[PDB]
Design a protein around this nucleic acid. Structure first.
Lengths: 97, 78, 90, 102, 97, 78, 107, 93
DNA sequence: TCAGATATATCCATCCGAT
DNA sequence: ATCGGATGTATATATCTGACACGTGCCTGGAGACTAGGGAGTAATCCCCTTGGCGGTTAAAACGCGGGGGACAGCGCGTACGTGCGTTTAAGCGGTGCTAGAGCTGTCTACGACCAATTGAGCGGCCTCGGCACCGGGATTCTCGAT
DNA sequence: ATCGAGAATCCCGGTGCCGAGGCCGCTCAATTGGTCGTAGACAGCTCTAGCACCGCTTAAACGCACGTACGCGCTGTCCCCCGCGTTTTAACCGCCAAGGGGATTACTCCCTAGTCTCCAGGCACGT
């Protein structure tokens, strides 16, 4: 019926996702990935739950910061969409690479 | 294989909180790679810290020590 | 072993009708510990720099001048000097 | 108690034993821990009043870490001191670039 | 009667400067600039020449890095000439505010 | 107005050493501003260190410490 | 009896007693062991030998006999591990490694 | 008074590595400052690690842990191997 | 020991789709 | 500009509930006194290292003037990408049970702090010639208007 | 899709120069050989929270059409940065004098560590 013009819903969800404080990432897949990565360095380890929570918080915060930086990079080139060139630029400048 | 545990909607939600309108289809693999490399970069120091103490479990203080080593201080877990 | 009741008393001094969560308590404890660590480390490093052997008021005043940004430094050093002169007065 | 002698709230004894046991220097002075107590009192007082103001701006009588994030990020001087730190369960202040808006 | 193309001297000077390791900045104007800046905090200060040279090296290295970043940011933007939007973006992404 | 002692050719030489090819006219003021800010931020700490030791001459090692504050770690001197 | 230096017992070249005195004076802990300074001296010796190898190679490459800071800068910038260890340090009088962007090259 | 420097040792190491190569004084200053920086960084990390475990002394193993933390990747692999070889030389005495 | 999260009716600021 | 319907936004009402602030006990850390001796404040002296100026020199900075090519505005197209809809999947959630290992307790001995001889490696002063920068000339290779 | 005049650059060789390296004399910090208090190495006991499993439920991830707007290529305009000549001027080098303060040395004194003795307020605990 009423077909929404694209972009307006995309413009939405900034209000709700900037006031929310949730983790936005599933718990069990993340814990399985953490255990998979830790399997390489040393076998037969056990993980504290609080450590997993803190890891998740740090990781999501780092991704949010990187996305902010790459958005600011992408708006420069008179474009609106993100391109992996922008990610490469952002990690190139700030000294991570 | 567990790197595919991060589906597209999670990445889109993170990007929306980052403040973006439109994302291309090539972003997901780059985000996955950056996430993964960050994980081993932290976990290496974490496992070293927990190994020096002669234990078998990574406490939260170890993770906090690992994060502060790289200059990314985290508050909330002592 | 934490600074639990002290921040609560300070809050009662400044805001007699507001509460805090446990998570806010942890954030305060960790923040105070971090700031204390920074100040103490800078003071020790500066005390070694001059071939000195003790920690005095001058060293910490210099460290506070060095770390905090401009506007906060004046207020902090003023209140600290007020405290030390009230202490040494009696 | 020495803390009441200077009229503060933070303990002189605890910071004194921390300074001696933390092995920063061979010998410690006398008025230095008092000075630390003063500066810590100042920092905690200002941050708590800022957080309380931000909390009552949201018709709330309790402090939550969201209030702390909003308060910390809203001051130019405080943002300079704690630029490189992530707060647990704190969220991010709202911002939208102007070009995006139609 | 023989004039070079407008963009060929640039590469020659890139080469000769990058194979160079001299100071590239006059000494006396920098010394008087440093004294002018330092007169605002505590008057009648007596600088040491080695400190002046150290300030020279640090500042020049910082500027060299900053223009490298600016050039990279500009060449991202399908352009050759740099404009102040690039320098502002590079400063902001590096986190200097 | 001593800040205008940093001439146009010097900025050109530094830009060339950076590895840029064509520069617009308005860059000069921005460079002269950012360099001024950087010198402010260094000299403040250096003067503090020299003032603390009851001296009136600024030695180079104090500048080395001051750069060490921002994590620049100048080599050579001292 | 005849006195033998501890650095000679281990076969090292960096002094050991100096490291021990520095660690005692450096006010890092209440007390120090005997097995630490030898380990630290060995690590320092290995690192400085590793850098000196590349420095000498770089100097030899341009038919020169002495060592100049330009050679050290080139040696550090060439090796990726040493670059990572020294990623935020400025070498005075060192210059910059040659690099020219590909797009800027004329067609 | 007297100034202390690492000049003689590093010269000996150079003559052990490359027989016929010279040194300028500025390079010597670079080497001295580099050695001081590395020593201070390692010592600080070791002291912090010893505090993290409620210890009161400096043994070799926490130095090894600090080396494993600070040096990037494979460059540590030799260094640790260089350490254990040296220390067991001294234990034999 | 009650301040606050949550179910329920409602709710006002905004946007497409023509007009 | 303009309105109509229709989605999603704040606001009040009610209803649990689970952290929450408020008493309680007791012992480990916090004051209070007396001493010493070693680090730190103060007086006096030099010598070197910085400041300040003078005059000659020319490398580099400043000014002016075509002119080509890079920045930028407008047009057009087609495809990757938003958005609803039906459908499947596995993440939460709540129980239950088993046990490896974190954490605390009690000894004693090997190990490092510390002190009194003991001496040879490392620093400062004084040569000195050989690698290295400079310059001048010739030989070499890239460049752009010409083909 | 080539070439030659010309301009920038590599190479050989001669020249002076200054500091990198070597030599020697003189110290104090490293070395030996002892003693002595204690930190943790070691063994042993406990109880918990970390792991594993299962059944149920539902919010969410996914595959699929489908219309579209904007990313990108193209064309065209025009203005402004570069290259080159011409004309100052202030950086720079070498020289000089002068005086002030940053280290030194000696001396004395007073402030905190140490030791012992006494006493409550702040950490678990309960509602």
């Amino acid at each position: 019926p009423h077909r929404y013009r694209p972009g307006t819903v995309a413009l939405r969800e900034i209000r709700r996702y900037q006031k929310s404080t949730e983790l936005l990432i599933r718990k069990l897949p993340f814990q399985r990935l953490v255990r998979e990565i830790a399997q390489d360095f040393k076998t037969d380890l056990r993980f504290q739950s609080s450590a997993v929570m803190a890891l998740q918080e740090a990781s999501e915060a780092y991704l949010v910061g990187l996305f902010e930086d790459t958005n600011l990079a992408a708006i420069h080139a008179k474009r609106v969409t993100i391109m992996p060139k922008d990610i490469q630029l952002a990690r190139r400048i700030r000294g991570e690479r | 294989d567990n790197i595919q545990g991060i589906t597209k909607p999670a990445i889109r939600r993170l990007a929306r909180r980052g403040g973006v309108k439109r994302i291309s289809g090539l972003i997901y693999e780059e985000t996955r790679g950056v996430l993964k490399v960050f994980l081993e970069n932290v976990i290496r120091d974490a496992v070293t810290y927990t190994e020096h103490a002669k234990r078998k479990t990574v406490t939260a203080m170890d993770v906090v020590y690992a994060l502060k080593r790289q200059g990314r201080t985290l508050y909330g877990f002592g | 072993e934490s600074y639990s009741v002290y921040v609560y008393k300070v809050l009662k001094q400044v805001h007699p009708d507001t509460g805090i969560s446990s998570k806010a308590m942890g954030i305060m404890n960790s923040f105070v510990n971090d700031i204390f660590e920074r100040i103490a480390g800078e003071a020790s490093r500066l005390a070694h720099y001059n071939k000195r052997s003790t920690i005095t008021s001058r060293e910490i005043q210099t460290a506070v001048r060095l770390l905090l940004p401009g506007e906060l430094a004046k207020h902090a050093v003023s209140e600290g000097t007020k405290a030390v002169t009230k202490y040494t007065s009696s | 108690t020495r803390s009441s002698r200077a009229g503060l709230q933070f303990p002189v004894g605890r910071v004194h034993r921390l300074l001696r046991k933390g092995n920063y220097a061979e010998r410690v002075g006398a008025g230095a821990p008092v000075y630390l107590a003063a500066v810590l009192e100042y920092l905690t007082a200002e941050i708590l009043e800022l957080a309380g103001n931000a909390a009552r701006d949201n018709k709330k009588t309790r402090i939550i870490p969201r209030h702390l994030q909003l308060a910390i990020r809203n001051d130019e001087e405080l943002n300079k001191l704690l630029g490189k730190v992530t707060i647990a369960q704190g969220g991010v202040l709202p911002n939208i670039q102007a070009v995006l808006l139609p």
